[PDB]
Amino acid sequence: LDLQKDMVVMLLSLLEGNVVNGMIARQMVDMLVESSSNVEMILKFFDMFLKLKDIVGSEAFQDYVTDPRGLISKKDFQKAMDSQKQFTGPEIQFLLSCSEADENEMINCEEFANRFQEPARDIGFNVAVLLTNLSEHVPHDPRLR
Amino acid sequence: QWDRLVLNTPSFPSNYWDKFVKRKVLDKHGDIFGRERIAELLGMDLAS
């Protein structure tokens, strides 16, 4: 993630002094469109975990955390995520695979929600800055939209 | 604080035209807050 942030800093440097509808800005948008699938995957990663942090704090989620320790079984976690209606089935499977469930299939929801927050903060902010810069300097582009 | 008394009444929207505000609220905040919890707050009978 730090390396991603360095690459995005280089990309942002390429836009210094750029004008509206600038050539380098349009080239950067073309490069993003060429990497459409991977850009979508990265954005989905960030979105998925930012949404996980909110769902774990949501009250409707805590209705399934009934064990005294505060852990949630994998099946109950699946049920809670299904009820929240915020993830697809494959996304919930991926979250379960990342949950680091213990031998008893119990998940520490607090640690799971906070695991990727700080590691991904810098690259997430830089991606937001890159998208904002490109959007404001290439106003009419549905590919960027 | 006083408006808390009218949330679960059967006839909350008596003068205001929108008679489905409770349904709209349930659909909007139902998933993140709990459909049963919202139904209890707004005095709705989900089954019926």
Which chain A residues contact residue B32 at CB under 8 A? Answer: 55, 58, 60, 84
Interface of B with A in 1-48 (CB under 8 A): 31-34, 37
Closest CA to B44 of B14, B1, B7: B7
Residue A141, CB-side half-sphere exposure with 13 Å CA sphere: 21
Q: How many of the other CB atoms lie within 10 Å of CB of A124?
A: 22
Here the tokens at position B35 are: 């459909």
Exposure string of A78-93, with b = 16+ CB inside 10 Å and e = fewer, is bebbebbebbeeebbe
What resolution, expressed in A, was reported for this entry?
Answer: 2.6
Say if residues B43 and B8 touch (Cβ distance below 8 Å): yes
Here the tokens at position A23 are: 């050539």
Give the technique used to solve this structure: cryo-EM
Cα Rg of chain B, angstroms = 11
